[PDB]
């Protein structure tokens, strides 16, 4: 069938700037609720250690009203041709890491869609409003989209956070180490 090969050589995070090294570049539809997003260094203020990819240095901190950002991944531009997406329908894997501070609560949300050439929603993974753990530990969201049918051409990845105390500043969910990949 193989194939496996074409997908193994293309296999890479397809999100640009998953951690904040490039500030907010690569992110579109940025919604700066309250004092907006801010990139901060890894251990944050009343934040726990990220023990997991030592190579991740930073995270995006949300504020006192929803902060949302998104990325649309053009699968053809990343090397996946039409027939391969319509026919094989390879696994599209989507992860995010989020956390909260210890002196204040926060909420987190993620939605990811598989879209067609013309923005038709073929598939969707949604968490709804999530309570971020109060103790400050890091949480992994993971989803694998398979058997999604033909037509998938983009992945739209979107996440957000805000605080739960309505505080001037950056007390909302923190997000980092985001990824989407096509897996063999």
Ligand X SMILES: CC(=O)N[C@@H]1[C@@H](O)[C@H](O[C@@H]2O[C@H](CO)[C@@H](O)[C@H](O)[C@H]2NC(C)=O)[C@@H](CO)O[C@@H]1O
- Interface residue list for ligand X (CB under 6 A): 64, 166-169
Question: At its nearest, how many Å lie between ligand X and the CB of residue 168?
Answer: 4
Question: Which of 162/176 has CB closer to ligand X?
Answer: 162
Q: Which residue is nearest to ligand X (CB)?
A: 167
Question: At its nearest, how many Å lie between ligand X and the CB of residue 16?
Answer: 31
Question: At its nearest, how many Å lie between ligand X and the CB of residue 167?
Answer: 4
Question: Which of 64/80 has CB closer to ligand X?
Answer: 64
Task: Tally Cβ neighbours within 10 Å of residue 42.
Answer: 16
Question: Which of 55/168 has CB closer to ligand X?
Answer: 168
Residues 6+ positions from 102 with CB-CB distance below 8 Å: 46, 47, 48, 134, 135, 136
Strands (E), the chain: 28-32, 38-41, 58-61, 67-74, 91-99, 106-115, 121-126, 130-131, 139-145, 154-163, 174-183
Question: Which of 64/154 has CB closer to ligand X?
Answer: 64
Question: Which of 169/184 has CB closer to ligand X?
Answer: 169
With contact defined as beta carbons under 8 Å apart, do 68 and 31 qualify?
Answer: yes
Question: At its nearest, how many Å lie between ligand X and the CB of residue 101?
Answer: 11
Question: At its nearest, how many Å lie between ligand X and the CB of residue 173?
Answer: 16
Question: At its nearest, how many Å lie between ligand X and the CB of residue 162?
Answer: 11
Question: Which of 21/103 has CB closer to ligand X?
Answer: 103
With contact defined as beta carbons under 8 Å apart, do 85 and 69 qualify?
Answer: no
Cα–Cα distance for residue pair 170/35, rounded to 1 Å? 7
With contact defined as beta carbons under 8 Å apart, do 141 and 154 qualify?
Answer: no
Burial (Cβ within 10 Å: 0-12, 13-18, ≥19) of residue 59: buried
């Amino acid at each position: 069938g193989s194939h496996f090969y074409f997908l193994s050589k293309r296999r890479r995070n397809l999100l640009r700037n998953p951690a904040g090294e490039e500030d907010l570049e690569g992110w579109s539809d940025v919604e700066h609720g309250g004092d907006g997003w801010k990139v901060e260094e890894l251990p944050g203020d009343n934040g726990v250690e990220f023990t997991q990819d030592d190579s991740v240095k930073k995270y995006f901190a949300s504020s006192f009203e929803w902060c949302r950002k998104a990325q649309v991944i053009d699968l053809q531009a990343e090397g996946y041709w039409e027939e391969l997406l319509d026919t094989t329908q390879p696994a599209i894997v989507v992860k995010d890491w989020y956390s909260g501070r210890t002196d204040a609560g926060s909420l987190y949300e993620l939605t990811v869609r598989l879209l067609s050439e013309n923005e038709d929603v073929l598939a969707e993974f949604a968490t709804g409003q999530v309570a971020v753990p109060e103790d400050g530990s890091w949480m992994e969201i993971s989803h694998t989209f398979i058997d999604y049918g033909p037509g998938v051409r983009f992945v739209r990845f979107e996440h957000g956070g805000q605080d739960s105390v309505y505080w001037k500043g950056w007390f909302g969910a923190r997000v980092t180490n985001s990824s989407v990949w096509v897996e063999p």
